[PDB]
């Protein structure tokens, strides 16, 4: 296509967008599609000359719309949210057409120096400490962009285990790095999320999930006591990862009892708020922030709650020097981000940032922390007053969790139920014996109407299920 | 604060501006006059509590971001690969991100993993791979994944071999530990492989011994076979090959040929880093590169070089998606087991409104052009008599320096960096300090190249009188 085109498909995809986003209630929120539907729908091969630019577009609502989860639909309920916004495409939009790298200041030096003076705006925003910012006269640490909290949590994972060696290596300079990785224990609460043993699997460090509390949450005494048992072992802890906001049910592990120890013990502490990191924006939901000094790093999505599109992941640490031993075999004004991640090529993914910061401001970003808390909030208020309905966990944030009193099958059928028109996507967990419904809060445009429209379809469901 | 009315008004603004950026980008100095730290104060120290202006932002673009930008869609760039945005790449992506979908399972969007799984298949097809590699070919238990980097893909490739041969080396010691065992392990690679392939070894702590190479910059059997019996004979367990299809340095080619047989014979995982001639192999001519591709558990290579989609966008195939998914799972397609981390995005779309945009014959003139080009470049260093080409120019890579010492070279590099008028990175094979010159821009012209010769010389022409 000529320039004088790409303007006129631009113009025809920004419409395209705007009306998509602005009547996405309308579309059934979870694909009829049984795997394997797309392949007889495209040709076996590539077309040779160029298909017209109208038989692409009109393949948008032809071939891929019917198969799309929306997940910007307010009736998208299932795992966390992923928002996307108007100032995040427009970020994008810019950086897509730069298409600049920054392995290195040099190789791109934009790319490198406003994620660093917004990364230290977000740590600010966040109530973070001071030692995770770039700029802190004091500070060793500072904050990257990610693509996930997933690799997040296992480059914090190869930090602590690389450090840990080397400290090791000194006492025993004829040993194997992979054979010192052996004796190290790794823990996580057993409400941790799956990338937490993923990262366990990739790096061969042991990992050992502990037993919680009546709230779900991850207390000082059961550390204490695995960390006591281990060592006894001759196993070394090395590693806890805390969750603030757990996928289940949101709970909160206990950072002020988690943070002494894992100080006093020598294991790196690595914070997964995938989620609930995004309320920390408010002073009321810091609560959960409490003991975070003790933490060696820190990750959130962005890319769930706070309307940047994926992918969008913040980390933060306390000790760049450890993170980039990590990834370069050689061990704060400007940086080469290359050792701060497990690839060479990095995008210019601030900008997008920047925008939606910039285009709503912190207040605004604070009321839709607050707008989606309310209207879970007001789905909770009707859930509890329905008495063959219960909630076995504590709402803290955007999720409810439910369930039918008696059997599963009641909760199950219920689900199956409502997967027959698809109008709202939920998704089944388990938290002990019991089978539970997940209630995400997500579209920023959520209202009281959705949010009754959808109580009301769920109660429907029910009804049939229980006569 | 910004509504759906001013969305579609600042969307235009956007995509005229995007227009204006690429179709000028000539007229910009390639690489920025900026010393690190000159950012911060330009900016806020803190974010805006209130909404900030569309015409602040927007107005910020020109104003504090693009002089600190490299323009790598430049003509005038040389250094690295290239990476290529293209319009069909960027109006792909504005769907993608405005759907936001996520990909860790079938079922999450089941779009997301399908139309990946159906390109995947065409893609393989358009580069002359094996049939092995394919989704949808009955013989298959193998298939192609998006990733963001070869980086990522040649770690994972590793992780995989590394984790099948510990769950083979535990039959016969069931009490060792996994990491225990991991220790014995041994894997290579060219002399020339790219530093992802070192960074591999140094995050899964599996040891890496780099080959030496041949006049011509290739890996060979001969070198491959030696390294293995040497290491055997010291209790090392051989595990791993990575070979470079279009070395970094002077893009030469590991010969496959010879490293398959023996990677086959000795159970050793063979993984292929093509990152940047990958591209190449639309082309049924430069294929020649590719023989021995029968014998490959693994290749990636880097539609976000050459092919014209903006980064991210690597391909990754493997011949046993089994062996893939044992690496990342603790044991309807879910591509969370083919890769790191779980959330993905819904790259698949930019990759095909390219294909599709283009054609096949489009992309392979494409390629055509850009190593017509490095030709025309070539041809001109080879007439003036103060330079020598000390490697071949396969593709769009000509490496070349002034003869005499690497003072001379140095100092012609610190002259051109000086206006920035095209970007240059040093680089060094053996002693011998080059410059690097990639073609980069699809829009590249031989009045493109002539200029850029031209400001070659011209600091030549100073260096040498000095
Ligand atoms: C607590 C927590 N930790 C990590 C992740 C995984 O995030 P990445 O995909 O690695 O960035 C999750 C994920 N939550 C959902 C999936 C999802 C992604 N975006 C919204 N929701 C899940 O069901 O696992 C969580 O919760
Ligand atoms: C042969 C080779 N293999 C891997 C990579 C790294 O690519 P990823 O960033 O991991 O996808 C490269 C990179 N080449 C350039 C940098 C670059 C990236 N895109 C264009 N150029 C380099 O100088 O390393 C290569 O070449």
């Not at 048992?229 to 206990?254: I, Y």
Request: glycine residues 6%; hydrophobic residues 40%.
């Amino acid at each position: 296509m000529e320039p004088e085109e790409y303007r006129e498909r631009g113009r025809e995809m920004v419409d395209y967008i705007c009306q998509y986003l602005s009547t996405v209630r309308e579309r059934r929120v979870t694909p009829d599609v049984q795997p394997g539907y797309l392949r007889a729908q495209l040709p076996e091969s590539a077309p040779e000359d160029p298909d017209s630019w109208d038989s692409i577009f009109g393949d948008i609502e032809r071939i891929i719309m019917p198969g799309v989860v929306h997940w910007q639909s307010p009736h998208m309920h299932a795992y966390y949210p992923a928002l996307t916004s108007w100032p995040s495409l427009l970020g994008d939009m810019l950086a897509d057409a730069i298409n600049c790298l920054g392995f290195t200041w040099a190789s791109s030096p934009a790319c490198t120096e406003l994620e660093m003076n917004v990364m230290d705006w977000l740590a600010k925003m966040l109530g973070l400490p001071e030692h995770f910012l770039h700029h802190h006269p004091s500070s060793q640490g500072g904050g990257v962009l990610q693509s996930t909290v997933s690799e997040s949590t296992l480059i914090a994972l190869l930090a602590a285990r690389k450090n840990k060696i080397l400290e090791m290596k000194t006492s025993e300079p004829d040993a194997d790095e992979s054979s010192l990785n052996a004796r190290l224990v790794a823990y996580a609460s057993d409400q941790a999320h799956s990338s937490v043993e993923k990262a366990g699997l990739i790096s061969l460090v042991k990992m050992k999930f502990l037993p919680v509390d009546d709230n779900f949450s991850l207390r000082g005494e059961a550390l204490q006591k695995a960390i006591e048992e281990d060592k006894q072992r001759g196993l070394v802890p090395v590693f806890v990862c805390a969750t603030l906001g757990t996928t289940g049910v949101c709970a909160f592990d206990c950072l002020s009892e988690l943070g002494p120890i894992c100080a006093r013990e020598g294991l790196w502490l690595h914070i997964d708020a995938a989620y609930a990191g995004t309320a920390f924006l408010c002073p009321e939901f810091r609560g959960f922030l409490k003991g975070i000094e003790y933490a060696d790093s820190f990750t959130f999505n962005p890319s769930k709650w706070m309307m940047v599109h994926f992918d969008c992941t913040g980390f933060w640490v306390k000790d760049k020097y450890k993170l980039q031993q990590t990834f370069s075999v050689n061990p704060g004004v400007a940086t080469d981000f290359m050792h701060w991640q497990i690839p060479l090529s990095r995008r210019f993914r601030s900008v997008k940032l920047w925008f939606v910061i910039r285009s709503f401001g912190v207040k605004n970003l604070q009321a839709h922390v607050r707008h989606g808390t309310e209207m879970a909030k007001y789905f909770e208020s009707l859930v509890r007053n329905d008495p063959s309905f219960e909630i076995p966990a504590k709402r803290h944030l955007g999720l409810v969790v439910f369930r039918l009193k008696g059997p599963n099958s009641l909760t199950e059928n219920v689900l199956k139920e409502i997967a027959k028109a698809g109008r709202l996507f939920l998704i089944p967990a388990t938290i002990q014996d019991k089978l539970i419904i997940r209630f995400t809060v997500t579209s920023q445009f959520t209202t009281r109407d959705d949010i009754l429209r959808d109580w009301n379809l769920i109660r429907d469901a029910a009804t049939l299920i229980l006569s």
